[PDB]
Design an enzyme around this catalytic site. Structure first.
Site, short mmCIF file in Angstrom:
data_model
loop_
_atom_site.label_atom_id
_atom_site.label_comp_id
_atom_site.label_asym_id
_atom_site.label_seq_id
_atom_site.Cartn_x
_atom_site.Cartn_y
_atom_site.Cartn_z
N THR F 1 13.03 41.65 30.04
CA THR F 1 14.37 41.76 30.67
C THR F 1 14.49 40.71 31.77
OG1 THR F 1 14.57 44.10 30.18
CG2 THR F 1 15.88 43.28 32.03
N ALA F 49 15.08 51.67 30.33
CA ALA F 49 16.54 51.69 30.11
C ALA F 49 17.16 53.02 30.54
CB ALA F 49 16.83 51.40 28.67
C1 LIG Z 1 19.08 49.06 29.63
C2 LIG Z 1 18.01 48.20 30.37
C3 LIG Z 1 17.61 48.86 31.70
C4 LIG Z 1 16.77 47.91 29.47
C5 LIG Z 1 16.12 46.61 29.89
C6 LIG Z 1 15.33 46.73 31.17
O1 LIG Z 1 14.23 46.28 31.24
N1 LIG Z 1 15.32 45.95 28.87
C7 LIG Z 1 14.08 46.52 28.21
O2 LIG Z 1 13.52 45.87 27.41
C8 LIG Z 1 13.55 47.93 28.52
C9 LIG Z 1 12.23 47.81 29.30
C10 LIG Z 1 11.04 48.63 28.70
C11 LIG Z 1 10.30 47.81 27.62
C12 LIG Z 1 10.05 49.05 29.84
N2 LIG Z 1 13.33 48.51 27.22
C13 LIG Z 1 13.39 49.96 26.99
O3 LIG Z 1 13.61 50.70 27.88
C14 LIG Z 1 13.17 50.47 25.59
C15 LIG Z 1 14.43 51.26 25.13
C16 LIG Z 1 14.63 51.23 23.55
C17 LIG Z 1 13.64 52.18 22.86
C18 LIG Z 1 16.11 51.59 23.17
N3 LIG Z 1 11.99 51.30 25.56
C19 LIG Z 1 12.06 52.74 25.96
O4 LIG Z 1 12.87 53.12 26.69
O5 LIG Z 1 11.09 53.64 25.43
C20 LIG Z 1 11.66 54.76 24.79
C21 LIG Z 1 10.74 55.07 23.59
C22 LIG Z 1 9.78 56.08 23.69
C23 LIG Z 1 8.95 56.36 22.60
C24 LIG Z 1 9.08 55.63 21.42
C25 LIG Z 1 10.05 54.62 21.32
C26 LIG Z 1 10.88 54.34 22.41
#
Ligand SMILES: CC(C)C[C@@H](C=O)NC(=O)[C@H](CC(C)C)NC(=O)[C@H](CC(C)C)NC(=O)OCc1ccccc1
Lengths: 240, 317, 229, 196, 225, 201
Positions: F1, F49
């Site tokens: 991000t 997120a």
């Molecule tokens: C909306 C923004 C705040 C998101 C942004 C911020 O970093 N970009 C990102 O890449 C973030 C960071 C994360 C890798 C720590 N990504 C995320 O938050 C992603 C969300 C997708 C699953 C929909 N990962 C997450 O939230 O984990 C949920 C999860 C839990 C178990 C299995 C699969 C997914």
């Protein structure tokens, strides 16, 4: 000049073995507008007459939804009815969550009876001032129930509550034999006729003043108001 | 100012004082207060505040209250005074209400009673609804105190009866209801006696057909004023209701018939529906204590009609 | 005039032999004796008009506000002390945002009035409120009684001269009324109860229109409306 | 990591703080102020865990400001230090413990200049001079070698510069600018930031 | 109802407090009543600093005022801790009015019994003056008075308040002194005056300073004669 | 991000990437990482997120209640403190949120960084997220207070693009918002693929 020492609280018992405050609360239902509930082999119908503060005002809602299979009509203090309706909705939702089964109407009326009884036996509590006519469909079949501020509940072939209710009750008793085999349209017509008896001769049933709620084997409780009541109203004959 | 005019007195066998006289002073003030009765009006309003304080102070101290010139100041006070008391009324309005109440509870000489009624009749004819409502409120205290003096003048009894009945048919609902309240109290104290002409007048007004037509539906109209026919029906029901409220704890022989008439008007359009509901609800509460004695006057059929009545407020059902 | 007291009046939570609760009825009537507020609902918009009654020239007129914004689409007109309605107005504002967070949507006026009624039930509450807003159904006006009963009213008047204003409102109101006509009628009725020349300090006027959010007329905007009368 | 230093002279207390706020590898801010003005004559310098420093220091500042509004007279520097020590100690065994290392510098008309050193474990010690942070190990000796109880305010600024110069030459971390303030009978006076 | 009326009687008996809102200065003046031959005047204040930007003058029961002032002062610090910004004069007035509405006990003299004139500057720098009532109604005023002679002082203020009167800081101080001088008769002996200023701490003028302003108004009156 | 914000003469510029990744899976390439709290205030989302979305939405609800209750908009400083206080209560419980609160208030243009750790700081330039290190360098080298609006927009687009090229967890499109005294304006949404052709060409 004729003051009674025993009518001050629901806790006090009169020397004649009567609790006056419960009897006074029972009279509160008669203050509310007339509501008629009747049942057939397959359907249960509640018909109520609403009243309005002004021509501009919409009209108060006598009939309320408790569950898909249960609906109630209120006569008496509205605030008490709202408290009871919220309690009934929670019990029904709990039954679906825990058992995935529509709560039997008889068990619900018993729970309302328990909730109403506690204010009668405790200090600084007014007994509920609302009388409820309950329409429900369960495995047993269509059911109409009446609740009282006294906390007593009655299973009724047909019942009318509110002002001028006795006139409706005389019609309901006269034609009760016909009610069991009546089709939904005829059963609603019979309820409208009983409600018409309560109305003064000058006043007549209108789409604005009449609310109809029907529950059935294949019909979830539905409240028909305004234009929806017009098909049922058109069939009814002119006042005798 | 009360002390300066204290020496002037209407006491018997008294020569005119060499000290200042209240009638001459009031006449100068009345001329100065004529514009209010823009800069001239504002200067007058400040004078009105000072004179109002003087009248409030002089109510108890003065040997003779109700000087004829002082009575002439009453109409201006009636319009200024508020119908409902509040602490946000700008002082002059609040003071005017206090002054009117103090003046109303004042001994009136028999000679003064015709003159005071004439001022009260004139203010009742005034356009301001507040003044018409205030005149009824002033009359209620003024009649109850000095009750026997007014009763001694038959002409006063006839004029007071006419003013209350005339105000009953007024356009403002608040004035119409106050007129009914005054009539019920006057009937209760026996200053005004219920008579066959009075009932016939109310019954005739009650039986007035409603127009049953809407000016708004064609459109291009702004009928803010209420329909006259509705006002006439309300006046008749307000009159019958006042007669019912006159005896709160007793049912006289005439009471059952009036109650039967009131029940018929229950379904009539508001504001008639509200009036019938309040009168019947008040009758039921006051007459519950000795109902067994009260029930005997009603015939069995009459009792049934009264029992099957919905006079419940909006909160019920 | 003369005292008319009965044993069962002023009994708190005691039913009268008739079944009525007299102490509650007396309390509700006292609450309805506040300043007059008029609301008229039209297809074009919902208009709320109130009388400020400022005591002194030094006082800032804006500080006394009888019309408040529950949300962009909902406004409330109150009769009586602002302090009595402060808790109820706050509950409505908190609920409207709480609903937005939970369901990402505006709350209909009927649902907002029901929430305020629930707080009133959980006790007279001491205020009469007119909630006017445009929702999914359209422009809508609701009246909340001190008892807590809520009804949709095409035109409603709350306050000291509400009964007289309501009769005048009934005759003037028509379903096809435009918002501009409604503003004129409510102000004309308000002038008749007030018996005072209408000025920006004397009256406060607010309107909610389908495209627009809650708008309170500014002193210049009100002056144009009053001059046309 | 973050560096705080204080020198208490005969009529004054001289305090300096690094002005860098940093994330894991990058310096987010170079204008950060780690000194909180608790009162007209009291400055609290707080360094430590993220979040804990801002929340605890602000809480102490609001309470000292409340004491002035309620009583109309300011807390003594000794009283302010004791109030901070009690609050930090109570939190030590609580579910929420603040990891904050603090220096309190203040002037009391009755007791003159005072400098107090408090660690995360809430142990309060009055000191002629004290420092916090990894750089304190390098600079404490320089202060020990040249500090005199009667040192002049100008000489104290020179001594502080020598400790800051030492940090640039030997400290692994980059601390380019420092915030310098002096507390006196007249009050807290800001001084030109020493920059490298 | 009866309790609110009783509280209103207590405020009416209270020492007169007059406040004026000026372009750069908000002034609060309270009359100082004589105490006793052997009493010390330091304890009696009647003008209190709620916070750096907000000051309050009270007329009413002294004991009830202490509780309200302490609760308000704790709120100002709590607001600063939560939002990091100085309290708006309206926000503190709203809190005090809510505290007056509920004493925290059913019945139990729920109206606090103090009417308060709250004066100060917002973070924006807008000067503000507000009045609190035992009822819990709070209003904003360019100038206002509470306590004995408040109604008479208000009428003098209504005529006297003008753009010219608030043009300079000295003139705004003089307007407060003249209005107080009608209700309380003396020089600087019976008057206490506090000047908030703009972006500066509340200053209570010393008796010598108030006397100099009192002397100037008398000289202007002699010139007017 | 990668999310970046800088304060310049003509206002505050807020920029963000559009990639949400579960593990090494790219779950989303269209995520909106800037939330519009009010017509004059924006919030940037980095870290988990759900954590950022729930807490920033809660701040937006609080800001509307403040506007309704006080009849005045919340300051950027007040909103930043409110988010810091709420996240701090849950400190050490695993919330991961890095946010920049950017808005125009009575004081002027405002930028604050709030972290799940509890850091709240105000600065002219801030970058947050996995690609923050890459964005910081390009932004720092080409950043000036006197930069014109068109020059400022290009710097924000370039800094996000270079960060996306180096960082696996950054990608998608560059969402650009400019905070102005009148209010925030959405400027442009540009795919890094389209940007790559323009910059490389
Ligand atoms: C909306 C923004 C705040 C998101 C942004 C911020 O970093 N970009 C990102 O890449 C973030 C960071 C994360 C890798 C720590 N990504 C995320 O938050 C992603 C969300 C997708 C699953 C929909 N990962 C997450 O939230 O984990 C949920 C999860 C839990 C178990 C299995 C699969 C997914």
């Amino acid at each position: 000049m004729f003051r009674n020492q025993y009518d001050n609280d629901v806790t006090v018992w009169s020397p004649q073995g009567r609790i006056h405050q419960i009897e006074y609360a029972m009279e509160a239902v008669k203050q509310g507008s007339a509501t008629v509930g009747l049942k057939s082999k397959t359907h249960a119908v509640l018909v109520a007459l609403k009243r309005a503060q002004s021509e501009l005002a919409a009209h108060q809602k006598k009939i309320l939804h408790v569950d898909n299979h249960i609906g109630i009509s209120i006569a008496g203090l509205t605030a008490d009815a709202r408290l009871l309706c919220n309690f009934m909705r929670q019990e029904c939702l709990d039954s679906r969550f825990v058992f995935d089964r529509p709560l039997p109407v008889s068990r619900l009326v018993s729970l309302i009876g328990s909730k109403t009884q506690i204010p009668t036996q405790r200090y600084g509590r007014r007994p509920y001032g609302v009388g409820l006519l309950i329409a429900g469909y369960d495995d047993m079949g269509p059911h109409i129930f009446q609740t009282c501020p006294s906390a007593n509940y009655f299973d009724c072939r047909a019942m009318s509550i509110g002002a001028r209710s006795q006139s409706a009750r005389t019609y309901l008793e006269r034609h009760m034999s016909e009610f069991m085999e009546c089709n939904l349209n005829e059963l609603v017509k019979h309820g409208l006729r009983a409600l018409r008896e309560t109305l003064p001769a000058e006043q007549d049933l209108t789409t604005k003043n009449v609310s109809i709620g029907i529950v059935g084997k294949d019909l979830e409780f539905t409240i028909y108001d305004d234009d929806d009541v017009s098909p049922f109203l058109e069939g009814l004959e002119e006042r005798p | 100012l009360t002390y300066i005019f204290m020496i002037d007195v209407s006491l018997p066998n008294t020569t005119p004082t060499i000290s200042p006289h209240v009638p001459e002073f009031t006449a100068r003030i009345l001329e100065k207060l004529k514009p209010l009765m823009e800069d001239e009006r504002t200067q007058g309003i400040k004078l009105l505040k000072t004179i109002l304080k003087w009248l409030m102070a002089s109510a108890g101290r003065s040997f003779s209250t109700a000087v004829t010139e002082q009575l002439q100041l009453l109409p201006l006070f009636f319009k200024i005074a508020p119908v409902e008391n509040d602490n946000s009324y700008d002082e002059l309005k609040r003071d005017a209400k206090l002054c009117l109440s103090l003046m109303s509870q004042g001994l009136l000489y028999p000679h003064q009673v015709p003159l005071v009624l004439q001022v009260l009749k004139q203010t009742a004819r005034s356009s301001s609804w507040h003044a018409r409502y205030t005149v009824l409120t002033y009359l209620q205290t003024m009649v109850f105190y000095n009750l026997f003096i007014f009763l001694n003048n038959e002409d006063a009894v006839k004029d007071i009866r006419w003013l209350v009945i005339s105000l009953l048919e007024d356009e403002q609902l608040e004035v119409r209801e106050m007129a009914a309240t005054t009539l019920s109290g006057l009937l209760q104290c026996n200053f005004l006696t219920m008579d066959s002409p009075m009932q016939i007048h109310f019954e005739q007004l009650c039986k007035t057909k409603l127009p049953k037509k809407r000016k708004r539906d064609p459109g291009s109209v702004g009928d803010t004023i209420p329909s006259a026919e509705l006002v006439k029906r309300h006046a008749g029901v307000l009159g019958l209701g006042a007669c019912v409220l006159s005896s709160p704890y007793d049912v006289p022989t005439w009471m059952p018939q009036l109650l039967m008439n009131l029940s018929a008007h229950l379904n009539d359009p508001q504001p008639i529906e509200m009036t019938v509901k309040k009168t019947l609800s008040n009758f039921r509460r006051t007459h519950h204590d000795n109902w067994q004695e009260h029930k005997q006057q009603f015939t069995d059929d009459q009792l049934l009609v009264l029992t099957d009545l919905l006079v419940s407020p909006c909160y019920y059902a | 005039m003369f005292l008319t007291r009965s044993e069962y009046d002023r009994g708190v939570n005691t039913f009268s032999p008739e079944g009525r609760l007299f102490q509650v009825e007396y309390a509700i009537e006292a609450i309805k004796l506040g300043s007059t507020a008029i609301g008229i609902q039209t297809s074009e918009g919902v208009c709320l008009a109130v009388e400020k009654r400022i005591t002194s020239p030094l006082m800032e007129p804006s500080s006394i506000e009888k019309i408040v914004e529950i949300d962009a689409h909902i406004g409330c007109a109150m009769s009586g002390l602002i302090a009595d309605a402060k808790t109820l107005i706050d509950k409505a504002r908190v609920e409207t945002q709480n609903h937005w967070f939970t369901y990402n949507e505006t709350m209909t006026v009927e649902s907002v009035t029901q929430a305020v009624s629930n707080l009133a039930l959980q006790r007279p509450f001491g205020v009469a409120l007119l909630f006017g807003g445009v929702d999914e159904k359209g422009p809508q006006l609701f009246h909340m009684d001190p008892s807590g009963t809520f009804v949709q009213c095409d035109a409603r008047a709350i306050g000291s001269a509400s009964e007289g204003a309501q009769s005048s409102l009934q005759e003037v109101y028509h379903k096809s009324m435009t918002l501009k006509e409604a503003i004129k009628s409510s102000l004309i009725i308000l002038k008749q109860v007030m018996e005072e020349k209408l000025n920006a300090t004397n009256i406060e006027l607010a309107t909610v229109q389908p495209g627009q959010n809650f708008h309170m007329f500014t002193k210049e905007e009100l002056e144009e409306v009053i001059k046309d009368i | 990591m973050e560096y705080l230093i204080g020198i208490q002279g005969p009529d004054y207390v001289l305090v300096a703080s690094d002005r860098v706020a940093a994330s894991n590898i990058v310096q987010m801010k170079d204008d950060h102020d780690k000194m909180f003005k608790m009162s007209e004559k009291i400055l609290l310098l707080c360094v430590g865990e993220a979040g804990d420093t801002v929340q605890f220091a602000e809480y102490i500042q609001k309470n000292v400001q409340l004491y002035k509004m309620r009583n109309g007279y300011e807390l003594s520097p000794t009283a302010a230090a004791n109030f901070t020590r009690r609050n930090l100690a109570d939190c030590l065994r609580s579910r929420t413990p603040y990891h904050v290392n603090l220096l309190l510098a203040g002037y009391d008309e009755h007791e003159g200049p005072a400098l107090y050193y408090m660690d995360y474990l809430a142990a309060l010690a009055k000191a002629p001079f004290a420092a916090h942070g990894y750089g304190a190990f390098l600079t404490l000796s320089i202060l020990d070698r040249y500090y005199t109880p009667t040192i002049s305010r100008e000489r104290a600024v020179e001594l502080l510069r020598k400790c800051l110069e030492e940090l640039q030459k030997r400290f692994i971390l980059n601390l380019p600018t420092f915030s310098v303030r002096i507390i006196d009978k007249n009050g807290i006076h800001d001084l030109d930031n020493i920059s490298f | 109802l009866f309790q609110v009326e009783y509280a209103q009687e207590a405020v009416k008996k209270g020492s007169t407090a007059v406040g004026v809102r000026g372009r750069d200065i908000v002034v609060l003046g309270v009359e100082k009543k004589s105490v006793a031959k052997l009493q010390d005047e330091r304890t009696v204040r009647k003008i209190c600093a709620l916070d750096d930007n907000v000051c309050m003058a009270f007329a009413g029961l002294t004991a009830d005022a202490r509780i309200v002032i302490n609760r308000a002062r704790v709120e100002c610090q709590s607001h600063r801790l939560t939002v990091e910004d100085p309290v708006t004069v309206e926000y503190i007035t709203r809190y005090i009015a809510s505290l007056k509405q509920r004493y925290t006990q059913s019945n139990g003299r729920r109206p606090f019994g103090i009417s308060a004139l709250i004066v100060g500057f917002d973070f924006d720098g807008t000067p503000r003056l507000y009045q609190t009532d035992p009822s819990g109604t709070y209003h904003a005023w360019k100038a206002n008075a509470i306590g004995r002679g408040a109604k008479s002082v208000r009428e003098f203020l209504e005529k006297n308040y003008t753009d010219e009167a608030i043009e300079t800081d000295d003139l705004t101080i003089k307007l407060v002194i003249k209005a107080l001088l009608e209700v309380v008769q003396s020089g600087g002996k019976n008057i206490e005056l506090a000047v908030m200023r703009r972006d500066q701490s509340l200053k209570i003028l010393n008796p010598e300073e108030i006397e100099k302003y009192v002397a100037e108004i008398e000289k202007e009156k002699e010139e007017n004669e | 991000t990668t999310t970046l914000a800088f304060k310049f003469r003509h206002g505050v510029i807020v920029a963000a990437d559009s990639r949400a990744t579960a593990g090494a899976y790219i779950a989303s390439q269209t995520v909106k990482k800037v939330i519009e709290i009010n017509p004059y205030l924006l919030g940037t989302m980095a870290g988990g997120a759900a954590d950022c979305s729930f807490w920033e939405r809660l701040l937006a609800r609080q800001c509307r209640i403040y506007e309704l209750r006080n009849k005045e908009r919340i300051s950027v400083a007040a909103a930043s403190k409110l988010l810091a206080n709420m996240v701090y209560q849950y400190k050490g419980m695993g919330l991961s949120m890095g946010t920049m609160i950017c808005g125009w208030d009575k004081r002027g243009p405002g930028l604050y960084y709030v972290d799940s750790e509890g850091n709240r700081i105000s600065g002219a330039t801030f970058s947050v997220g996995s690609g923050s290190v890459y964005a910081y360098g390009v932004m720092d080298r080409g950043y000036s207070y006197d930069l014109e609006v068109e020059q400022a927009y290009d710097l924000a687009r370039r800094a996000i693009y270079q960060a996306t090229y180096r960082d696996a967890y950054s990608g998608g499109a560059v969402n650009l918002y400019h905070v102005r005294e009148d209010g925030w304006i959405r400027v442009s949404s540009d795919n890094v693929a389209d940007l790559h052709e323009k910059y490389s060409g």
